[PDB]
């Protein structure tokens, strides 16, 4: 009178589980990229909506044949979040408004899944990373935001498109705040270990032949030019998050530039999360790479650190 | 005075190129799934919109660091479509309205890329597959629609969820029209080569203990219940298309149930594209699996074939 | 005076760790397949040789740039085995000789890594699976051998090559002992849910047009015909093991035919590991699929079960 | 009276085909890595042995269930080689002995597959790359050897292990001849865009605290220390080749350091293949990165170029 009884003779817990907070344009970009990489053994989704959340879950589950993920669960309560190895926080609705949400969600994240690494994808990323470090009570190394990871990704595609090579080949970084105030360190930009700064001194300046400073002006401009055209950017930031979840889940110790506490380095006493190249692993951020910067470059960190803390002093937690 | 000149000393054509027609909810689901599998060596996007198309391209290109795809191009003209190995047609706006678009696009698809396989993702899939076979002048085997591939995928997730196993293990099929009129062949449903029909005869009927006929009623119902909640289904049908592009590009000879001409089998003289298990390869559809069906099951094909052709007779090409 | 101090500012445990026991022809096939799939976050290797083991480790580590695995460790002591999520036992040198090795290794496996699933790859697989269940003190569901998984794989490639389709499409199984005595269940053999037994009754017999019974005679023959030509088979059984480690690590609940205790089903009171389709997950074997067999087919299990226990009664543990 | 006739109703050419020349320790490392990445839509194997070749083919084909490759063919005649997109030449048995084989094979490679890129894996790689450019009549850009690609890979694993990070993060190169005479360019070595040479000047020298010059001494030493222990290195060089076949097949334009003609740069008039960072694509080598080297470093290229041509002058083709 039953198939399951007659067919399947019995001889759980999440393993690599990842939770994505929010089903929005960018939160379902991260999920389908995380599932497209087969990182998570369970994918939990949580958002304040009752139905779309259930519709995003069912639309993914119907593709479970095509996925390496077994259990895809989504609820509006954070019970599903339990046992999450990483919690990707895309939830966002101006900081003190977002701090209304993160008071509302982040401590629910941590009640059910204490070990989780919290990756903060939502803009503003640098402050909402502090917001989520304050009120989650997780260590410094278990709460990090996406940050300039995607900026570094956009920067390498641009730096490659001008050279025609593949973005993985052209290595250059973006540090600092996520506005016009990001630091593109040209001392590290290079291809095949051939420094570009070395050969052409005109880089990192006001003017140059190709005015390569336009690249960093295009890096910060393209983010919006994608926002202009289709209304907001998702699959760029969802591929970046999936690549971070890969570093942490697969425990690779890869260097991503992510938002972490800058207190103690680059002349900053304030508790501020600013994007710095960091070695990510299963445990959290394992370390930070120490970036040798021009006095002028450390200045942009220092100043832009203050721009955050100047408006991060009035946060009401 | 130039990096590219000084750095890169010179010592093209698309290879696996895939074009996706449309940037809509489901057309960018297919792209990011195709890119997430690294199938296409070039991904061309085309849609009637000037800007979102340019925004979907740039949002993908910014993730090129994270992708195995080198060139992602998008234009509103079909010059980009040139040399496409597969053209995934998601464009859709009721058939004779869609046949306005496919007159407008499909012959532009074929002008630039004559060898392309045309995969038709758009609803109605069975008729718009005929529409695109009529006016493209491609062989029967190079024009196929998605069809019940995703229905078969939803059907296996359901058939597995009731058994708790993984959808790849539970093998069952969906043939025929894409409405309530799909044929779930229970003679093939099984797990680990254990036929479910064999053990419980009550399957495929009006009533059963678990009333397993509800599965096929849930297969056709879930498609809408995803449409209800979030407004439309994308990442299920985009993972299905990416799995079809994989069969054809990687030239696997895998059996998918896709929309192909049923003239000559199952008592149908009409030229009608109805979903049948077919062996897909690089060349196109290589063949069809011959499905042994109940008289009653061949009837649903036969009748539902007529439901198509009854309204496929008045098509104005 | 140090790069590491100046460069990397500090802000462990194995996660998915897999241990492969033995570096032999088949044990390095499993490793490079497991690493080629990026399953293990750490790969531990252990074998009785001091140097080749260190050479197999270094030859893999030099490819770490190309791998998704971070730490590849190999020692002759089983300290490295610690925290293994799965222990793949390829060690083998006739059962009571192999039981000399498994007394020597298997309890060292379990001292350092109590939670490990033990996958037994080594021939004889069915008995050395019992040998390793007796003396490891692990549950029934955490000790399983490869078994007819690869037989099922060879069987599907053959069953497909005759049909020209891709082996993933043609579903047919191999149960029982690993000699000529395997059970190819033809009641489950099919393609696209079209039973082959159904249409041609001459299958599973003495004679047929194509004498499809030759397939199962070729399945058991090819294993040796690979052993004849190059001396032994590795990358077939290493891809099979990597696909098992994937089911268990990725926690997929996929159905593989593996060696598990048959006590209680198919009329067997003896404690005997015989290859049966089983649902594998992170926890172990989750269940067994109940295979509906001809009286004659249950007989081959029953008899071949005794052939094992007849020589499994004199095992000295 | 036939399954294939009754089941499969008909509705070819290699696409991405790769040929590996030789089944030896390193030639089956490349195959199982190429198949493990699903690069080739057909894999052709060729070697001078009748049986092992047939045994290597069958051992791979039995794993076809687990592979994304459909057709794996192996013959001793080069008919199978036809339509190869890349031909990986592992065949080797001292140059003028190897030039006996490449007279015997390389023109058979090119008779059946004129468009093929020829990747030369076999030691000596730099000369046997010239040997195969002379007698194949392919362009400069379609014949390249593995070269210091794997040296660069070993160099990054070492450079990372000292830093604890993941080898993909630490970017440093190996140019030139494949002996002790390789050039480790320290001007490019760095992590997260932080030059190591910049901070510690003692690098690239006779003595340093960690004497980081030992890394390049370990890079060249480890190659042999793997050769010592297990007799020869395979899965390092097979993962490197699979990563080259990926750059070329997937048409990525990635920068690998491979053996190409150095005539015209670094003060070399001779026709000599020496390892230089090069942008690989579908067409061949697309270009070369221009490496800014110390006078002393250009010297090692210049001199080691002569060491090749001094014994490359007496080649009898």
């Amino acid at each position: 009178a039953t198939l399951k009884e007659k067919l399947i003779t019995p001889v759980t817990v999440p393993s690599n589980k990842i939770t994505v907070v929010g089903v929005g344009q960018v939160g379902m970009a991260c999920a389908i990229s995380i599932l497209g990489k087969g990182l998570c053994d369970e994918l939990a989704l949580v958002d304040v909506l009752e139905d779309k959340l259930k519709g995003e879950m069912m639309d993914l589950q119907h593709g479970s044949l095509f996925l390496q993920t077994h259990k895809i669960v989504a609820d509006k309560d954070y019970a599903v979040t339990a046992n999450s190895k990483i919690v990707v926080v895309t939830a966002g609705v101006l900081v003190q408004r977002n701090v209304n949400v993160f008071k509302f969600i982040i401590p629910q994240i941590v009640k059910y899944s204490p070990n989780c690494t919290i990756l903060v994808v939502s803009n503003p990323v640098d402050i909402l990373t502090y917001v989520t470090w304050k009120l989650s009570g997780l260590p410094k190394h278990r709460v990090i935001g996406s940050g300039c990871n995607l900026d570094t990704a956009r920067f390498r595609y641009l730096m490659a498109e001008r050279l025609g090579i593949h973005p993985t080949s052209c290595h250059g970084w973006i540090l600092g705040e996520h506005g016009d105030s990001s630091v593109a360190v040209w001392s590290g930009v290079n291809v095949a270990g051939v420094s570009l700064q070395e050969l052409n001194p005109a880089m990192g300046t006001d003017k140059d032949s190709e005015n390569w400073k336009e690249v960093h002006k295009q890096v910060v401009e393209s983010a919006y030019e994608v926002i202009r055209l289709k209304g907001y950017t998702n699959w760029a930031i969802g591929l970046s998050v999936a690549e971070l979840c890969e570093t942490m889940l697969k425990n690779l110790y890869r260097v991503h530039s992510v938002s972490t506490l800058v207190k103690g380095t680059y002349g900053i006493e304030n508790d501020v999360f600013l994007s710095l190249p960091c070695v990510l692993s299963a445990s959290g951020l394992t370390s930070v790479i120490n970036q040798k910067l021009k006095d002028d470059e450390v200045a942009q960190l220092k100043k832009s650190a203050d721009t955050l803390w100047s408006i991060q002093k009035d946060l009401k937690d």
Side-chain angles (χ1 to χ4, degrees), chain A:
Chain A
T2 305
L3 296 183
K4 166 61 175 171
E5 182 277 339
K6 183 179 294 295
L7 181 56
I8 300 172
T9 302
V11 173
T12 193
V13 180
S15 299
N16 283 284
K17 180 174 183 175
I18 294 174
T19 304
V20 181
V21 176
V23 291
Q25 189 176 0
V26 48
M28 287 305 299
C30 296
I32 195 60
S33 296
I34 287 168
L35 300 174
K37 299 184 70 66
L39 302 171
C40 52
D41 299 348
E42 289 85 356
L43 182 69
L45 301 175
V46 294
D47 192 2
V48 299
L49 270 57
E50 63 180 346
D51 56 11
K52 175 182 170 61
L53 177 60
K54 183 184 174 63
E56 298 301 330
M57 172 182 70
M58 291 176 68
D59 195 7
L60 297 177
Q61 289 178 335
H62 296 169
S64 292
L65 175 65
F66 308 105
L67 299 171
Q68 287 296 319
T69 298
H70 186 64
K71 184 181 177 181
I72 297 169
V73 65
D75 282 344
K76 63 182 294 177
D77 61 355
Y78 285 73
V80 297
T81 295
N83 290 281
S84 289
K85 303 291 281 186
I86 298 171
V87 175
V88 180
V89 174
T90 315
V93 69
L94 64 88
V95 171
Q96 187 67 55
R97 294 184 61 185
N98 291 338
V99 185
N100 285 337
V101 180
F102 292 4
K103 288 197 301 182
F104 182 77
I105 63 111
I106 300 297
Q108 281 286 96
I109 285 169
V110 182
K111 188 179 70 65
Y112 295 94
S113 60
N115 292 280
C116 64
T117 299
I118 295 168
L119 177 68
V120 180
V121 182
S122 62
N123 282 336
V125 61
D126 289 341
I127 305 165
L128 272 61
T129 306
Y130 176 79
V131 175
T132 191
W133 170 67
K134 291 303 284 184
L135 67 93
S136 63
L138 268 70
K140 171 180 74 177
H141 59 79
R142 298 183 191 175
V143 287
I144 60 107
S146 65
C148 290
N149 188 340
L150 173 58
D151 292 347
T152 301
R154 288 196 289 265
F155 175 66
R156 291 180 177 175
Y157 176 74
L158 296 172
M159 184 63 68
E161 193 282 338
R162 291 178 178 272
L163 276 69
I165 66 170
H166 196 263
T168 59
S169 301
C170 51
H171 310 287
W173 288 90
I174 299 299
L175 283 70
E177 183 183 0
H178 200 57
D180 287 343
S181 56
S182 63
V183 179
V185 53
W186 300 92
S187 301
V189 175
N190 59 339
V191 166
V194 179
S195 296
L196 296 175
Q197 184 70 61
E198 179 68 10
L199 70 86
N200 279 340
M203 300 175 70
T205 53
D206 294 341
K207 186 177 180 180
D208 182 8
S209 64
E210 302 86 354
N211 67 342
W212 287 88
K213 180 59 176 171
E214 186 66 19
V215 174
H216 182 202
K217 295 186 188 301
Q218 189 176 355
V219 172
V220 181
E221 186 65 12
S222 62
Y224 305 134
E225 186 173 2
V226 174
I227 291 169
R228 183 179 68 202
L229 273 54
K230 67 189 191 73
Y232 182 76
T233 186
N234 51 341
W235 293 289
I237 180 62
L239 292 169
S240 301
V241 169
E243 198 71 18
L244 291 168
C245 299
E246 181 185 7
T247 307
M248 297 185 283
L249 291 179
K250 290 192 173 78
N251 191 342
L252 292 171
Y253 291 88
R254 293 160 65 185
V255 175
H256 301 289
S257 65
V258 294
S259 294
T260 187
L261 283 176
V262 189
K263 174 178 177 289
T265 187
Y266 300 94
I268 295 168
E269 286 84 358
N270 301 338
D271 285 347
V272 64
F273 288 85
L274 196 72
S275 298
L276 300 176
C278 296
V279 170
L280 278 70
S281 66
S283 298
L285 259 59
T286 297
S287 66
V288 178
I289 294 300
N290 292 129
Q291 191 69 254
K292 294 292 184 291
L293 293 174
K294 299 181 182 298
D295 182 6
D296 184 65
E297 294 172 347
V298 175
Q300 177 66 268
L301 275 72
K302 287 186 295 183
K303 186 183 71 64
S304 298
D306 293 346
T307 304
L308 301 174
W309 180 252
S310 178
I311 74 105
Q312 180 170 340
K313 65 181 180 179
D314 57 353
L315 297 178
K316 299 178 178 73
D317 286 345

